[PDB]
Design a protein around this ligand. Sequence first.
Ligand SMILES: CC(=O)N[C@@H]1[C@@H](O)[C@H](O)[C@@H](CO)O[C@H]1O
Length: 398
Amino acid sequence: AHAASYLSVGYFNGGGDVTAGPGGDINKLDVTQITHLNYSFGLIYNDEKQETNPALKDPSRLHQIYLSPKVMADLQLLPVLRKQNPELKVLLSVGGWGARGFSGAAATAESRAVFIRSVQQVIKQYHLDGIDLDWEYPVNGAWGLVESQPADRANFTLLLAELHKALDKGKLLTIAVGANVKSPQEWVDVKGIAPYLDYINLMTYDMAYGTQYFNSNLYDSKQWPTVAAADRYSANFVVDNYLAAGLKPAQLNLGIGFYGRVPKRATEPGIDWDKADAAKNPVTQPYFTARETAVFKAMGLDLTKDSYFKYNDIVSKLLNDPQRRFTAHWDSDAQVPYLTMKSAEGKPLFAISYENPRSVALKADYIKSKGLGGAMFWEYGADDNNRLAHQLAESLGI
Ligand SMILES: CC(=O)N[C@@H]1[C@@H](O)[C@H](O)[C@@H](CO)O[C@H]1O
């Protein structure tokens, strides 16, 4: 007689993203398929010396939120989206991969107050239901991609506490957190911040690095196993790490990638940093040759720079490749699909893993069985005719 309610929180790369590229078309989204939209991204005016976005270096706006023209214009369509789905909640996500300014914004009482005032101003001007902070990452700085300091852990908590106090009742405060095991251990006081957050979005993807083949495997592959311990990740492992650190499952949304990645293992030696004279003794070697890298290059994917491939492009360019160069497979342990390309020798080479309707439904089944609060996905612009979002909505009963 009583039915559970799951969330489906769809990121949309509207403004542009360092790794996913230019922003998409908000008009193509089906907002009836989701519960929450994270419009991405607000940026942060900052004094980091390595900032290359000159707009963000305006010293009169230090620590405030920056909204690009495209972001402003898209946020103007909110009334139309709300008419199509009057239950929809819309948040602005601030930060994203490579986004500077959190370490400075969070550092002092005065800096925190400026940031918070800016958050309040943006919520009010654009009539948002809340704010999502996507700081990559406190303390670690994504290994120097953004400035960081050890005080970031404590300061993130203070920032969230003070933002929670400032926000109107009813406004949502959320964050996205990293897959890396050091996130709950060292970077983010997850127990400390939990009281201030409506939910926590887990970035349970981007695992196709180092000696790992799969990008968003639910469990570890056995057929295509990761070699170095420090690289061995799955969505469930991440979930378990956050739960071990003291978060309740109902507060968590599992991140689902509407995209795939060509693993780094295909093109770069894989180093196990636990081994003797590690860099001279790689534990995997690249298996792509110029023949393979050229196929991807011709698609528009330069594997020396990036490995991201949107799901709609996987369908149109890989699955439906007129020359039939890609073969689709299912990994029964990892519960995701992957494609192989045939080497000149005739051997299948592992090309890319991704998510399809079947694997999305299996992640929804995990959400339901593990007792998580819902799904989050990156990102709506990468879906194919809203099919993966619709699958998620069907499987979660949204
Ligand atoms: C797009 C992305 O997430 N890249 C990161 C990278 O910063 C990092 O070097 C590695 C762990 O060292 O984890 C990868 O997932």
